[PDB]
Each structure stands twice: as structure tokens, then as C-alpha cells.
Amino acid sequence: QTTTVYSLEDLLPYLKQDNVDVKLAPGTYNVNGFDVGEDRLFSTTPLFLFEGSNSTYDFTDVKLNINTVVLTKFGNNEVNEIQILGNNNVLKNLKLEDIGTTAPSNRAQSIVIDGRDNRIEGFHLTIRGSYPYGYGDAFGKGGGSVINHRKHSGVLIRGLRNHLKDCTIISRSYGHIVFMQAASYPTVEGCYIEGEMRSTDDMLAEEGTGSPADKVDFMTVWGYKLPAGYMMSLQAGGIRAYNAGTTYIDGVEIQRATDNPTVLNCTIKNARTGVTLAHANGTKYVEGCTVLGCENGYSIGSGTVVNCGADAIYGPVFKNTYGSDKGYNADITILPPSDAYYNGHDAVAYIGGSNHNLTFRSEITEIPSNLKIMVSGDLQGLRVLHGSNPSQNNFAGTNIVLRNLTNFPVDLHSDSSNITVTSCDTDNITDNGTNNSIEAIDC
């Protein structure tokens, strides 16, 4: 009972209907500035507002090119390209590309998933257009920013039991790539998520150019001049959950934290973090993932990370977020480097909180001398120097199992206690903590 349409104009009325089975015919469809206006294709934002329920939309072999100037055609208002408000919808196989790099007038998201039991599968999304682009979050990601931002993020998962499956999300925009706000039981599965990087040294080389960073003398939002020797993503989170947000289900506005997120078989490359779910409540579960060249690998706060890998070229593979982290169980492989090392954090892992069970595995034999597993201590992390983000650094670790099946050294700080360490080698383990146990393992 599939209805096939051959233009965006004939597609739009179906987005208001329940129980439809619609296919946009293979082809290339362009959305330009002249398509936005009262008498034009798109009079309102979101451009594609899926209000119906129990519908299926087939975008196989559809290329949708959206000119980034459309992000400025709705005044000082947020522009979403796609938003799902209905329930039990399936959208599949769309290839969506932002054309050009024009920044939104306010902010933008490519896709916002509200409602319940929706699935977006097989999408290929290229995100462009944001301001400032080139600094990551160094000069602001919220209010009071050093440089005023106009962010543009990829997929915002909200609602209930919403599902992003087998998608490719490429971001060249300052914003999250995939993030969750007020989402209950979201699932991200089989996705490839990719940003790009820039060194802080390259940013500092803007001295004397009159760039926005040069005009503030490179003073970051963290309270200090941008330090040399770090590799930053130009994006925010690869997959990042919020402890806040607004969603809509069945007409009901809901403000709540993300809860019960699941991330399965995802690859995240060159983002600010691979998988960060520490701010979500409920059960956090991450399995089968690969994090490459991110500033941080896995930070879920509490729950399970199993059969996951990350390299350590730009940041630690593992970070406890706060000293209140409790019950973080993790089995992480430190992968061979995906590119040259540029890790100014001087750690492959930062461990704290209590009652964790942590296994690290690696076949790396060539260990850079600045890389160690830290239990407590003063992490030289880009965003936590000099008292910045104080709850995220310099906290105690107690009652933690640490199985170090790697050649990386371990430093147990004086704030660590009751750490049960097993390790391939114990000669490179420094123990300044209280009542820690260190035992050797064979190979």
C-alpha cells in the first residue's frame, strides 16, 4: 500500500497523516533559500515535521541537499531540518547533506526525535554551518560564552524508546553529533559518527591575525589561556547524554533527564567524547563500540561498558566523571593508535569514585612515556586545569577492582584507597594510596 511521490511538495502533506506508507522516489532534491517563505515550499521550521504516527517513509537513493542559508531564513529562531513528533514511525535510508557552511541565525539541529517508538535507520547525514567553527568549546558552549556561538548539532534523541540505527553521521559543524535530552530508553545502534580535529597549537598560531580567539587573547571559558599541546575536536560530543531537556509525547511537554540509554556496536571518530552517558539516570549500557581519536573514550558514570575499544592518541580511553561515580563496570581494549599521538592529558585513564570493576586490555608494546592509568590525582585534562570544572578532577577512589592487562603504568594517588590491582607487570606501578593491593599476573 506504498504511495510514491516525486517531489518534496507532494511529500509534505503525508507528514501530517497517520498510518501512511510513503516513498520519495530515488533522485536528488535541493532545498535553497528561495524555497523558504509564505508562498514557498517551506513556510515554517522544522522543514520536515513528522506529526503522524504508525507511518513508514522510504528515502532509498534519495539525496536531499539543504543549503545552509536556510538556517538563516527563519529569523532568530532555532531551525530543525527534521523533527518527529508522532509515534511508531520508521524513516529509512535518506542521504542528507548540508550545502555550504553558513551558520544558523540562532542554532540548528539536523534531526530531532520526540514522540515514542520511532526509528531512523540507514541515514547518511553530513552536518555543516555553525559559529564559531574552529575552536571546539574553548570559547563557550552555553551562556556567558567568551565567543558567542550559533551551534548546529546532528541528531537530538528525545522522547521514549527512540532508536537511531545503522546511520552514518558526519559533522563539520560546531555542535554535538548525536546527543540525548529528556530521552527515556534511547538506543543508538550500529552507527558511524565522525568529526574532525584541530590542535590547540594551531589555534594559538592565530596570534596577531585578529581572529576571534586572538581578540580575546586566547582566554578560554575554563579561566586560563588556551594551553598548547592538546588535540581538540571541532565538534562536541560523539554520543552525549544530558541530565535535562524538553520532549513532547502525545501532546504532553516533559522536562526530565535522559534515562536508561543503550549504545551498541557504534564507531565514533574525532569527537570531543566517544560515549558520555554519566548525566543520564537509570541503566547505562554500552557494548561493542570503537572510539578512535576522540578527546575522551568512555564516561558513563555508572553501569556497563563491555567489549569496547578506544585508542589513546588524543585523550584517555576512560574517565570517571565525578567522585560520586559508583558502580562503573568496564572492559575496555586500548586500541592501536589510529594516527600519531597528540595526548596532552598525560593519561590513558582517570579513575575515581567507588565500587568500580575495571578491566583494561591492550597489545600495545610502544607506550608513550606520558601515558599512565591514574587512580585519583590531578589530571592534566584540557578542561580541568587550574581548578576548572573542579568536581571533574582531584577526587578520591575507593573500593575499586583494577585489572590492568596492559603494559601501561599505573599511578595510585594518595587519595586512593582499597584499590585491588592486578597487572601484567607491577614494577611500573606507583602506590601512594592507603590499603591498596598490587599483585602480578602472567601474560
Residue numbers in the entry: 1 to 443
Text of the article:
We first measured the enzymatic activity of 12 mutants and found that eight of them (D137A, K141A, H176A, F179A, E236A, R240A, Y242A, and Y242F) almost completely abolished their activities, H279A mutant retained approximately 65% of the activity compared with WT, while mutations of Asn243, Arg272, and Tyr322 to Ala only negligibly affect their activities. These results suggest that the steric hindrance of Arg272 in the two mutants may interfere with the substrate fully entering the pocket and hence the correct positioning of the glycosidic O atom, thus resulting in the complete loss of activities of D137A and E236A mutants.
FdlA from Flavobacterium sp. SA-0082 is an endo-type fucoidan-degrading enzyme that cleaves the sulfated fuco-glucuronomannan (SFGM) through a lytic mechanism. We show that the FdlA-NTD adopts a right-handed parallel β-helix fold, and possesses a substrate binding site composed of a long groove and a unique alkaline pocket. Our structural, biochemical, and enzymological analyses strongly suggest that FdlA-NTD utilizes catalytic residues different from other β-helix polysaccharide lyases, potentially representing a novel polysaccharide lyase family.
